[PDB]
Design a protein around this ligand. Structure first.
Ligand SMILES: [Ca+2]
Ligand SMILES: [Cl-]
Lengths: 285, 292
């Protein structure tokens, strides 16, 4: 692979996961793109020729006929695509308006129809497109200032539900951490029972996690109270009729009697600095 | 719905942001809508991705404390011992904070366009002596302020302390912070850092360009600051190439601006430049291949 990769890839695998059909015909999927992009990355380290050399030499040694042909064919039409993406001129308008981003996207769509067919366009981009359109759409639903926020929120939820289920599950997975905070902070802002919290957790993460989460709560309580009770003793030493070196020594001694490892000694500084300046200590946000 | 196992690492992929906007009823103001299609991508490629939502504007230390806890939460939810931290811009020092206080929970640190050696732009804002510049500085600051002021009450209200944030990305602040969390930071002005310390792998890759594609509404702005960052412009527009080197530099010359690094805006970038999404999917492969 040292013959195909650039100096920066000398520590990776080749992303070319090209799906062949039940008759050895390249089926264009989202990965087909990833494959090209993989080599394209070499540009900037390589010249445009080497980027072709490498790619061709790789496909030759991996796949045969007929797919081979189709591959290089589509590759050529993809490169000439990359270059022909410079043929999109900036339209005159408030460069921070959807009707802009939309057009800027349209311009590309039209270029794609210059090098690919519906089927190929679908195979190479569809996936990404879904999200792009999802993102664009939201913008217009937010910029539509003829709707109440309560309505916008509704349209957002409705638009979300229109995505292919996959995306919903994935996004919900990528937002799980936030969902946890949301409910943890809501349920606790009105003093719910430990059981309610337990169910809420058991629901979103499961028993196994719930338990370690409970384990964490405790560890934080501890840490928190240690610092709490620590700064109190530090303040007493600060407001004492002693000398600087004596206060620093007393403090040091208190710090070594509660915070042994170098690690805790760092974190402490964080709270120290915040406290000394009358800021709220960072435990909950 | 995941098609391949190309970015399936052992330990989860955790992304920390920094320096973002007001959280309106969008979805992920400073979350998923920060890393344009990188996350879902790495997700379909078999990875286990978790985005962290820390205070956008605050000291490296406070953000660090915030992040850390989420890290623990994640370790608890995943059941995996260590995590792979990937921070962009201010997220860089923010993951370093966690690395410094919980090296047992950190498998790898990856910083993209991080102002480790500080950012000249940060200094300028704070200047008082330099009356003419200071003018444009205070001014610009007031605007950047106004823009977030336009948001108002943030639903996800994070302790907002911009001054400290600025002081944390300054040439002095970053030095002060380095002196305490020097793991991965170079001793030479523009060399690399340690590849590995305390059993933690460290990687940094950044861009050295301002103007990438004039359709990016922000290139105009980034070009402005690029001159503040460096006259000869060896920067992504905010963070010089030197201040972004940390541990092993995968590559520090992408035709990316400070936002192209996160695939912004909407995926607009130079004509022939590597796709952020694929660069990330490629790094994610290397961590897997490192048994991380
Ligand atoms: Ca751009
Ligand atoms: Cl590039």
């Amino acid at each position: 692979e040292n013959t195909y990769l650039s100096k920066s890839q000398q520590d990776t695998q080749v992303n070319c996961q090209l799906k062949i059909n039940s008759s050895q015909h390249l089926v264009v999927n989202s990965q087909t793109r990833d494959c090209f992009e993989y080599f394209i990355t070499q540009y900037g380290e390589s010249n445009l020729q080497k980027v072709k050399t490498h790619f061709e030499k790789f496909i030759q040694d991996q796949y045969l006929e007929p797919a081979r042909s189709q591959i290089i064919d589509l590759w050529t039409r993809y490169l000439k695509y990359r270059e022909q993406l410079a043929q999109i001129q900036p339209s005159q308008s408030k460069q921070q308006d959807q009707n802009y981003f939309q057009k800027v996207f349209n311009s590309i769509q039209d270029i794609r129809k210059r090098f690919f067919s519906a089927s190929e366009i679908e195979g190479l981009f569809s996936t990404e497109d879904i999200y792009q359109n999802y993102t664009l759409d939201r913008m217009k639903i937010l910029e539509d200032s003829s709707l109440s926020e309560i309505e916008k929120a509704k349209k957002l939820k409705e638009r979300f539900e229109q995505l292919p289920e996959d995306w919903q599950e994935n996004l919900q997975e990528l937002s799980k951490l936030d969902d946890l905070h949301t409910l943890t902070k809501q349920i606790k802002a009105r003093n719910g029972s430990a059981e309610e919290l337990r169910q809420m957790r058991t629901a979103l993460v499961g028993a196994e996690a719930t338990q370690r989460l409970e384990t964490l709560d405790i560890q934080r309580n501890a840490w928190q109270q240690r610092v709490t009770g620590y700064l109190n003793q530090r303040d007493e030493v600060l407001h004492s009729n002693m000398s600087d070196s004596a206060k620093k020594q007393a403090i040091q001694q208190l710090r070594q009697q509660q915070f042994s490892s170098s690690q805790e000694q760092l974190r402490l500084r964080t709270f120290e600095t915040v406290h000394d300046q009358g800021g709220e200590l960072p435990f909950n946000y | 719905f995941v098609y391949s196992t190309y970015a399936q690492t052992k330990y989860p992929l955790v992304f920390n942001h920094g320096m973002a906007g007001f959280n309106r009823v969008g979805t992920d103001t400073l979350g998923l809508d920060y890393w344009y299609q990188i996350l879902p991508d790495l997700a379909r490629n078999g990875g286990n991705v978790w985005a962290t939502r820390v205070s956008p504007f605050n000291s490296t230390e406070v953000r660090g404390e915030q992040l850390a806890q989420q890290v623990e939460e994640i370790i608890a939810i995943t059941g995996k011992p260590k995590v792979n931290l990937i921070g962009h811009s201010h997220g860089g020092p923010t993951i370093r904070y966690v690395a410094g206080i919980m090296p047992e929970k950190v498998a790898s640190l990856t910083t993209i366009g991080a102002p480790h050696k500080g950012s000249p732009m940060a200094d300028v804002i704070l200047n008082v002596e330099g009356t003419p510049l200071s003018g444009l500085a205070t001014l610009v600051n007031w605007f950047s302020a106004a823009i977030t002021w336009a948001g108002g009450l943030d639903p996800n209200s994070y302790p907002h302390d911009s001054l400290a944030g600025a002081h944390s990305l300054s040439t002095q602040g970053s030095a002060q912070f380095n002196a305490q969390f020097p793991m991965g930071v170079p001793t030479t002005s523009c060399g690399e850092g340690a590849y590995q310390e305390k059993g933690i792998y460290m990687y940094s890759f950044s861009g050295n360009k301002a103007l990438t594609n004039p359709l990016d509404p922000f290139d105009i702005a980034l070009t402005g600051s690029s001159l503040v960052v460096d006259p000869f412009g060896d920067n992504d527009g905010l963070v010089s190439r030197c201040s972004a080197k940390f541990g092993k530099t995968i590559r520090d010359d992408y035709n990316w601006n400070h936002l192209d690094e996160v695939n912004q805006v909407m995926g607009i970038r130079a004509i022939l430049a590597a796709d952020p999404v694929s660069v990330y999917r490629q790094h994610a492969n290397r961590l897997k291949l490192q048994g991380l």
